[PDB]
Each structure stands twice: as structure tokens, then as C-alpha cells.
Amino acid sequence: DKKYSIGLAIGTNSVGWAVITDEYKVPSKKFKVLGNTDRHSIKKNLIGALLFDSGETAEATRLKRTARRRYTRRKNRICYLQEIFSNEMAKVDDSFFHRLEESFLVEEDKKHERHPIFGNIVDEVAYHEKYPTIYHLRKKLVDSTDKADLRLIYLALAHMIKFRGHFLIEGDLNPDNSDVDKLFIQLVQTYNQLFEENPINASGVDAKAILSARLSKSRRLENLIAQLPGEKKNGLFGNLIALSLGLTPNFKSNFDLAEDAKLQLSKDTYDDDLDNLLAQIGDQYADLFLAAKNLSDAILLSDILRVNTEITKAPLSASMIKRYDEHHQDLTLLKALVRQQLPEKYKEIFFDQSKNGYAGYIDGGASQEEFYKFIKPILEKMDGTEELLVKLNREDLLRKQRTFDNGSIPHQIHLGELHAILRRQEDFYPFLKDNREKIEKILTFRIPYYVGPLARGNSRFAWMTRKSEETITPWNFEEVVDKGASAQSFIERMTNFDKNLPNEKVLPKHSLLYEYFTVYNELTKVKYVTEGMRKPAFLSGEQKKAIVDLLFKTNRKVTVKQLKEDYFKKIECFDSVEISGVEDRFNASLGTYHDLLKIIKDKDFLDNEENEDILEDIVLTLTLFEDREMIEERLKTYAHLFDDKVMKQLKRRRYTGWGRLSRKLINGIRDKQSGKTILDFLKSDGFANRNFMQLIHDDSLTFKEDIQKAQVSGQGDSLHEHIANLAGSPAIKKGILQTVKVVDELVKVMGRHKPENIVIEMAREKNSRERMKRIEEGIKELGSQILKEHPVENTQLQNEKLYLYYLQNGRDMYVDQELDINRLSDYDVDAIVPQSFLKDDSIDNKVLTRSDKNRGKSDNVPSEEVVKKMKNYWRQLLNAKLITQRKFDNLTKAERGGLSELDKAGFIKRQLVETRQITKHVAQILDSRMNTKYDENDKLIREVKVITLKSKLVSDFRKDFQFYKVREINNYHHAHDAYLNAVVGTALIKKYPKLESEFVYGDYKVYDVRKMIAKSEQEIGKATAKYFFYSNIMNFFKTEITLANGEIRKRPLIETNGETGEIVWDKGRDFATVRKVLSMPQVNIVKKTEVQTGGFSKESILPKRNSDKLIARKKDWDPKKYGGFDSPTVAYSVLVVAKVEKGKSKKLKSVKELLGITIMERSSFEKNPIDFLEAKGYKEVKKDLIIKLPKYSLFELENGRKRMLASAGELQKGNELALPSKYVNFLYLASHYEKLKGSPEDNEQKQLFVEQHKHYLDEIIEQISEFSKRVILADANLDKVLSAYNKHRDKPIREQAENIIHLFTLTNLGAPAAFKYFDTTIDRKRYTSTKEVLDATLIHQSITGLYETRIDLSQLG
DNA sequence: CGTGATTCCAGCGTCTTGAAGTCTACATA
DNA sequence: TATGTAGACTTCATATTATTGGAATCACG
RNA sequence: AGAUGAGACGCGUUUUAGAGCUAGAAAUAGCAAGUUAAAAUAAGGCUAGUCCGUUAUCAACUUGAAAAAGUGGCACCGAGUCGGUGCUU
């Protein structure tokens, strides 16, 4: 019944929880232990951690589910195609389909003849010889007009439909005119007919090879132009070739036109633009451009497939046949050459399936790239292989028909081939003629994005609403599914709700309102300085409107030069202007406005606000519904305002992505007194010009209050729903839920009381190239030659001193002293703002100088004399991006305003307030779960204060007072960090009452910079209630205060509250108490048990083998003939005490053994456990003794050895290592784990401490041994570690600890893992036997681990 | 003849966009 | 006519790793 | 730098078919051939659909078919995974 506080630290893999009283001790409690063991009470501390498997995302589940749906859909499509052929096939061959369906079974289990296609070996051999592959059959069917057997037609159709190719390309691309060279000849003929006086000789030019080569468009155009000595690329023929290749040529020069004749086939408007062009050029040239477009289509076809013969009626089959012929010829040549020149490598390449040779490439698992890499050196070594080497460079050597690059084949090719086959063979089979439309519909059927899966109220993923209850087929899909209702449901379901307003719809990424908001947001912080203006002024409403209209509505991108010239010079008549806040091209732009102006060609319509809503409905309509038909259907309602060309142009364009804000948050909510929305505020703000971040965080505006009101009550009362809907990764949400459960358990344990303070902080969860680019840009801007004199790479630039030296161009930021490399060790990095005023330690805050005394006087900011010295030097670095704007202003803070009260207030808020918002939601959950009562004023009684603090304060506290953390020694660091969280939070709230307004939730009123800030000097006694003149937060804990020049100040031995007089910190006992708490050997580490769910087993389908470990992939197909999956993931083990038949006599012998239940059999076991256990071979099962052991069950054996049952057959280390604080401090100091920043005298003292306590290293190697012999029992690894340590006893202490930190994985918690001591690698130790835990003590531990239930398994059986 | 130590392995790619580099008609001396 | 010169426009990328439990393999007292 | 969600594509993997031949009596040796196709692609279930099955959740005991609810004093001295003492019961 004593007042106490709870400290919680939340992490992705950990939840640390500690309990503190008001004396900063740690309470210890007696707990009863249930079960049949002798122990009936155990004393445990209230500080510990909870560990669990990291939360797994749902991406894998989504991918697997989609794959399964696609496979079922494809199988049903094949079934429909078989249905169409059912009658005719039964007329021709009554058992063909049954033979096709059962081909996978071996001869023993087959019901018909083993040969599928024809049922006799002779006809099968004839078919295979007459057609090597199905592509030969398809081409033969297409070209020939003779009647073919029904089975061949069925096989061709099935292979066409089962693999229909992608549907990315929309429209039509196969006009049956795709011969590149032939179309080029036709274009030349048309050009010669139109221009008889200027003919072009194209004879001898291999246009087909040039255009179809794997080269860029410009390169191919140049190559083709080079083949015509008398033609240039800017000529009419060159422009036509560029258009065919897909470039953007201008025909204005060729015909001396006034309008810029820019024609591109990608743009839809070309359809009109060409015709309008013809208006000036006449109708004679139309055929020329039609031939050019046909040639372009031929080139596009040639991009994806290669063909030479002109007799092709099927562009795909001919290409595959050509590739097959090339493969055959190259294989024969390669075999001959290998047998001739290098007979020693014949067997390896052509017989060994293990190797990456041809045998492994065809029969084994060798991929194409592996085979190319293996055969390239052999081909290079041999002679006469120039053809093969060229093919290998072109990646077309010994290829197959099924390759990874077939994923670009559009369905048009297969559709055309199927249409050709049906046209050829319908004259001999009437049903094909009658059902041609059905087959084409089956092949082209694509379930549209909006429609979604075709469920009937049994699936939680589908939202399709049908017009009638009937089976859905591709032939009648147009009428069964109601398009409009499904589209509306898709709109209302798919869109992601706004984070700020959970009940509002987010805007489209390219919506007009969102783009306006983005433009205005950055527009309100732009400033301009001219000659006549004394001080820069903010853009007024008239200026912003003029800039938007003249620039944002006329130029796609607005640059700094454009802003300065087109507006300030043209309108404001300013010759020189200095733009502040924005540099270079603006990030925001009105792209959608320009796109709509291009389409509708009505600027006034876009400028009309009344039509805006309609425009919005357009943007969303183009944001989603990729399918064209629905775009047309929905835009039909607005088709009355636009022409058919405009409607088609709107249909063609499609947008992507989404925005970040809702529509109401931009223009829906209005302030109480002003009566203006956010966009209205940005339009006319006047003096303030507050941005969106300031507008939503302005305490003087109702916007923040409305945001707070809308945020709460986001969903129902259920905790699970609130956890689920939190914006974050699954791991962090699991951590939050576990944290809530842990704090509820703690509330329960402490006698149904309620904590007075709860502290929660959440751990935060490439650069070298960026820093190198920044350095290069700065050097190029300055022109210095320091890089040539001192070259460096990214590996050596780890130390911040070198980075500062490069950023300073080998100079000093305080004096005009040239930097010396040999003096870099003597140099001391100093913070621009002293550590007393602010603990920033950032790179921009760091400055490298010869002597810190040169920084200036005791004033925090460096002296303004240094500013007068190096104003230009600093501004050059600022303009060269070497330094940041914040760093430049901090260097010049003394000149500008010294140390204004605003700087102090900002420092305090930055040190205190939490930037992220997830912590606020966690605090809201905790407050609603603790505060449940109201006062007389109907206001929530805030008994529990949920204070939140950043991790930086706790890290600084750890580093200040020799409280060092090592993230590899053990897992107590989570609990210790939670304990320090609680201590710091309680101390800070007690010391500073008013600042609690920022800590505790929004119920407390806000304050201002007036209080707690002294105008000048360190006023003694704090009479005016000013808490800290210095801008620190936690500096009162230490016994001294440093200054900028090096001056020192002292603090009282005991710190007490300023007003109430309560003691807040007893420096004579509090540090000793914290040391004792951190030195406690007993900390509660419990692993959260998780019954394993997931894949039934590894998905790699292993070949057949003579073992029982294989699991059948189907009910009938036993694994002894067809192989199957292996290594199932055991969901949870089951301890059964029963008897099993033994020997030929089947004698029942009592056995106690662990049985693993797979995920596949889990449902069967959980339905009828007794029947399943009997089926596996257990007789007379003790139902009451069946004990469920999930993964991570805890076992204790003699001498405190702990194990975790990771599965049915592998155990994990279950013990933690409790090290004294002195050894941890020695390990952290000696290893230089973090940066060595600090006072040089302090660094020297730490180095002396490291040197004087070297022998501790040996002690550590002792303790692990004494630990290992009672915990790990891995003698070989321990001996190898001892030998390696003895070998490296002479290594320097700088690197004699970086290896010992990695050495602790030997006796760590979790799964065993291999490590490396210097160059000697110690492999992981495996526990292949779990028989011992059958005679150990099982420990059922509560979620926080305070309660126990010990079961002595030895007392069974 | 388990038994303990050692070795190898696990289903995976794409569905557009933006900065980079460059060629160009045009302004100015 | 020679040299910038903004500008329009094609081009080359536009994410990496990882545990840890199963099974196989093999020396071995 | 926040998660969930709809539609396709390309493969990969496993069995079978594409009679391997010659000299041996087999074991073996030599020679020819390599591309493709059918089925499956988590066991399967009922709700029988172009549905659903790898996300979230899950200590023990008692009640409740489930959703959920309820279960065990405290103080002090120390510290090798907690022990001892006092008090209460």
C-alpha cells in the first residue's frame, strides 16, 4: 500500500519493466509457487524484461494467398476449355482427358496406357519426332490448312491458354503487319513516290539488324543515318525514323510550318495532331505517316521477339523454332570442339549433373547465368569459338524456350495465334466456328482490379455485389456482376483513412487541392531581400496569388531564377533579390493543372472553383480503376461537359499513388474566431504566415483543439482494435499490446493499487556516399586542392574528426590557423552551444579547432569577434553546402541576438517534447486504461500521470555517471534502461512542476517562455520562480557545471524541490542506490511463449528418397515414389505419458517422451487428441497427464541450469549472465564502444583506468568458464576459446576488447550462434537430445514472470 | 551403434518515377 | 558567324542482409 | 521514412512421357540425346464460391461450449539468478 511508480521501455523485441518507490529503491516481493514441488515461496525483485519473437509482417501471407488464388483460377480456366471440347473429344477419343489428368502417377497406379497423347508408343514417338516442341505444333497448325487431329488442336489451345502472357499493354499491337525490313522498304518506297526528285538508296542497308538491336533509340537512329550518306537525322526521313523508334521529332523544319509539329506515338492527341498537320501538308502524306506507324509497331514487336523469315503467320512460334535450331547447331558445334581440342572436360560438362555444365544446366538445378559463367573461360581458352563467344556476349547461347525474360510477352501474340488456329480449323469442325467467341473470351478474360474476388459472403476480402445468384463464367461476366455498386464499395473500402482524421478520406496524390496545399505550404516561408528593403518581408496574399497565376499556372516547374526574373523583375521591378527559405527548383508543382489544361484546353474551366468538385471526382476516377472500361463508364456522367476527343484523352491518362492528408483537414475545418480554413489561412495570413505544422500546433487556434477532439475515440472500446489500428509495424504494435498487458499485470501484483507515475519511452527502430558527395560539392565550389593533397575513402572517414577537417577545408572555424594532421590528436572537438546549455553533439554542432580557449569568453555562443573575423568564411561553407544553415546561424548567434530566450525555450522543448506521435497514442491508451473516474466538474481524475520522454536524456544519464551499457553481455540492459527511465522521469517531474504540462497529456494547460527563463545572469535562489537560467534539463544531477571558456560551477550536495521543499535527489545515497540496483544478480527475464504458426514445411520439393521423413504433397501420392516436402515446423510439443508396443511381441512398455505436433496435423490433434495419439502409435494415453508445451517453454535442471524447448528436438540456452558493474564499465571503456567525445582530461582518466585494470580481462575469461561449466556444458568450444585467448594475450588493449564483446554470444540467451575470436571461428553448439528435460522441472511463467508454477515431471510414470 | 561433430540448406523476379547526362535552337557580341 | 545558355529531352538506375531448426553425412570410441 | 487490401505475368521445383544404342553374361566401357509437354504447387475444409487455409492472437489453475471473468499478505538485513529474520495467516 506504499506509493510507487512503474517504468516501461518498449522495443521491437523487448519490453522492460521496473518498479520504483519514492526512495528510488526496487521493491522485492514474496510469491507463492503452485505445483507439486517442495518449494512453496520464492523472493523476487520487481524489475525485469519480457522477450518475444519479433512481429512478422503480412507481406508473405498476401503473396502466398494471391499465388494460390491464381493457381486455382488457372486450373478452372483449363477445366472450362476442356468443357468446350468435351463432346467432340468424347466422339473422337473417350478417355483422352482422363489420361491427361493422371499423367503424374507412375505406371503402377495409372488406370490407362502410360502414353498420354495417343495411348500407343508408336504414335507418341511419331508425334515427338514430327514436332520437337509444342511451338513446332503451334506453327504447323497455324501455317497448314489440312485437317488436323482433334487432340493436337486441344493441346495447342491448352498450351496457349494456360500461359496467356501479361496484360500490361492495352489496345492492339498485332495488325498482322510486323516485318521490320519489309515495312522499312515500304516507307522508302512511299518517300520516293512523294519525293521523286530526292530518292533515297536503301539497298544494302541492314535496317532490320540496326533497328532491332539491343541499343538505345538515339544510337540506333544515328546508326541508320550513317548508312545513308546523303541523309541527315534532322531531315524528313530522319524525323520519320525517330518517330518510328519512339523519339520526339519536330516536322516544322521539313515543311517550313509555323506551328511546332511535334509528333509522338505515345501521346493520344497525335491522332488529331497528325491530321491537323495534314491540314497544312495535304492528304498525300497520310500514307507516309501510316507506314511510319506500322514500322514503329514492327519495331516494338521486334523488341520482345526475334524473327527473320517473312512467311510467318505467328511471330512467337517462328522465334522459338529459330532459337531451337540455333541451340541444336551450337550444341553440335560445341560437342565437336570439346571432343577435338579438350577431351579431358567432356565427361564433366556433358555427364556430371552436380557440376554447372550442360548436364547440370538441363537436368540439374544450374541456372542460365551460372552456366554462362562456367563456360565462358572454357570458350575463351579454346580456338575457333568466336561465334560462340559472340553469342555468349549477346546472351543467346544454348538457350531454352522457357526463360526468365519471357515475362514481357503480351497476350496479343497468343490471342492472334489462337485466332489463326481457329480460323484455319473451323472449316473442318463446326463447333470451333460456333464457339470461337467463347474461346477468345476465355483467353482474354481478366478479372478487373475493382471487381475483386468472386465470393458469396464467405470471404472477408471480397466486396463484389452481384445482380443475380448464379455461377460466374467468363462468357456471362458482363451481366452477372454489378459494376457500379462494386466500384462504389471499392472506393469506400480500399482508400486509406487519414492519420490525423481517421474518419476522413485521404486525397489523391495528384489532386488539385492537395497540390494547392503543397504549393502554398512552402510558399508561406519564402522571403525576399532587395536594395530598398531594410528587412526581408513575407509574401503577401496578392504576391502569392500573382506568383501562382503567372508561374504555377503557366510553368510546370518554377525555379529560383524564374521566380526572380519573371515576377520580381517583370512585376515588382526589382533588379536584385535574395530568395530565402527555398533554393533551386521547387519541390512542389501543379502538374495536374498542366495535364488538365493540355487535355480540356480550357484554362477558365480549371480556374473556375465551381467546377473544382467535378475535377476532383475526375482525379480520383483516374487515381484508381486502372481498367479502361470503368473509367469510361464513370466519366460518362461528366461527358456532357467535354468532347469525345477530350473524353478519350482523359480516359487514356492514368495516375498513381496517394496523398498524405484528407480533404476536410485542408478546407473543411474552420477556426472559431477567424472563420477560415487551412487553405484560407495560407491564402491570407498576413504577419504570422504560419505553415501547416505551425497551424496544426498553434495553441491560439481551434485547429489543434479540433485535431485533439477528432483523434480520441478513433474506434471502439476493445483494446485489441485500438492496438490493431495504430499506425506502425506489426512488431511495434505487438510490443505495445504486450506493454499494456505487462502494466496490467504489475497493477494486479502490487495489491490492486494504482501507480502514481508511469514512464514510457520507445526505442528508435549510404551515409558515407552522401557525405562524400557533400564534400565533393563543397570542394568544387571552393576550388581547393585539399583532396589531391589528402585523398581519403569512406572506410577511414568513420572518425568525425576527419569529416570535420574535410568540411573545414583543413582550416579552423574560430581562428585563421591552418589545420595540421599531426596535431589532430591534440585538437579537441567543441560544441558551438556548450554542453551545459544544450547536449546536441550533432555534426553541425561540432567544430574542430586548435584550442577550445580560442572559441571566445565564458559566453555560451562564441564571441562576435570571431563572427567579424570569419563571416565570409562561414557563409562560403554555407553556400557550398559544407555546413548547415543552423550551424551558420549558431556561429553567428552572438552577432544576431546573443542567446535569446527563444533559443532557451526551443532547447528545453527539444530536450523534453517527443517528436513522434505513436508515443502519444500509447500514452492515451495507458491514461484511458488507468484513469476511469471523474470529479464534480465531470473532468477525468488524473490519478496516473503518463509522462513520455525521449531516449536521448536517458542515454546522456547513462554516459554521465559511469552507467555503461553493453548490448551483447546479456539481456538485463532492457530492464536497466526501463529502471533508469522511471528514475529520470520521476525526478524530472518532481523537480519541475510546470514542465509536466509537456510531459503529461494535454489536460494540463500550456505555458510560455516568460517563466523558467532568466533575462540575464545566473540568478541565485530562483526567487522569481525561474528554474534554470542555463538551458539544460538534467544538469542538476552532476556535481559540477562547465562553461564555454572553461569556468566551473558547483551544485548542492542534496537537491530539493524549489517550492514544496521536498527532497528530489540525495547525491550521497541515490547514486549508491542506483549502483546497487544495477548490480543485482536477480532480474526477471522471461521469453514470451509462442505456439508456432506458419508454413507446413519448407516449400522446396525434394526428389524421391527412401526415408520416412518425407511428407506427401497429396493424399494419394505416397512419398516413396513422388517425393514431397520435408522438415515440418513443429507448432508445439506435447508431453505424453503412455505405453507403446515394443518388439515383435508388441509388449507394452511405459515410456515418457516428448512428441512434436506439426502445423499440418495441429487441427487433427486439437480435435481428437486421444485418437491422434493412438494413431501415431501410443496405447493407453493418460489424458490428464497430456501437457502442452509451446515453443520457448522453460525448463530448470540441477545447479540452476536453464533450458528452453525450442522444438521437439533442439534446446536453447535458458540462463543469463549477471556481471558486476565494474567489469561492464571496464569492457565499455576499454573497447571504445561509442564515440570518445568528452573532456580530454576525462578521456585520459578513463584510459588510465583501463590500463590499471588490465588483469580484469583475465578475470572475465575466468568467469565465463565458471559460468559455462554450470550453464552451457560445451567443453570443446570453451577449450577452443581458452586456447585462442591464450594465443592473443599480447594484443593491444584497444582491440583486445572488441573481440571479447563478440565472445559473449557463447553464453547468451536465445538460439546458439557461431562467433569469431579474431581469426578463429567457433561454430555453434547444437543440442541434439531433449531427453534430459523429461526429468527436469518445467516452469510455467506468467507474462511478466513474477508468478510461477513449477511442475516436477520426474514424478510422472 | 548410436553418437557426437560437421556440412548444407531454406522459393524468387516484374508490373512506374526521378535525377543525370546531353543535345539544341536561339540570344548576343 | 562564334560562344554561351537556358532548356527540352533521352538514360540509367529506382534495398540490401539476416537467423535457426531439419536433415544429411561422416569419423569414431 | 506507417500497417492492411484487389488483378495478372514469368519462372523454379517434383513424377511421368519423349522405347537410348553398341560390345560384353552382368558389373563396366564407348557412342548418340539434352531445349518440351500433362498434373501439383502449401495437407485439405465446408459455406460448394473463379470461396477459404503462412497476418494479428496464445503462461498455469477454476468457471464459462467460447467472449471473458476470478486466483497468491507485509516489513527489515543483505546480494551469484535470491537467501535469511521479524510480523500476519
Numbering used by the authors: 2 to 766, 775 to 1366
Copied sentences from the primary study:
Cas9 is a CRISPR-associated endonuclease capable of RNA-guided, site-specific DNA cleavage. Cas9 enzymes rely on a dual guide RNA structure consisting of a CRISPR RNA (crRNA) guide and a trans-activating CRISPR RNA (tracrRNA) coactivator to cleave complementary DNA targets. Formation of a complete R-loop leads to the activation of the Cas9 HNH and RuvC nuclease domains to catalyse cleavage of the TS and non-target DNA strand (NTS), respectively. Here we report a series of cryo-electron microscopy structures of Streptococcus pyogenes Cas9 capturing the directional process of target DNA hybridization.
Subsequently, catalytically inactive SpCas9 (dCas9) was reconstituted with a single-molecule guide RNA (sgRNA) and partially matched DNA targets containing 6, 8, 10, 12, 14 and 16 complementary nucleotides upstream of the PAM. The structure of the 6-nucleotide complementary target (6-nt match) complex reveals a 5-bp heteroduplex formed by the sgRNA seed sequence and TS DNA. Hybridization beyond the fifth seed sequence nucleotide is precluded by base stacking with the side chain of Tyr450, which was previously observed in the structure of the Cas9–sgRNA binary complex. Comparisons with the binary complex structure indicate that TS hybridization is associated with the displacement of the REC2 domain out of the central binding channel. The PAM-distal duplex part of the DNA substrate is bound in a positively charged cleft formed by the REC2 and REC3 domains, stabilized by interactions of the REC2 residues Ser219, Thr249 and Lys263 with the NTS backbone, and REC3 residues Arg586 and Thr657 with the TS backbone. Consequently, the NTS is positioned parallel to the guide RNA–TS DNA heteroduplex within the central binding channel. The 5′-terminal part of the sgRNA appears to be conformationally flexible but residual cryo-EM density suggests its placement in a positively charged cleft located between the HNH and PAM-interaction domains. The HNH nuclease domain remains docked on the RuvC and PI domains in the 6-, 8- and 10-nt match complexes, with the active site buried at the interdomain interface. In the early phase of R-loop formation, the Cas9 REC2 and REC3 domains form a positively charged cleft that accommodates the distal end of the target DNA duplex.
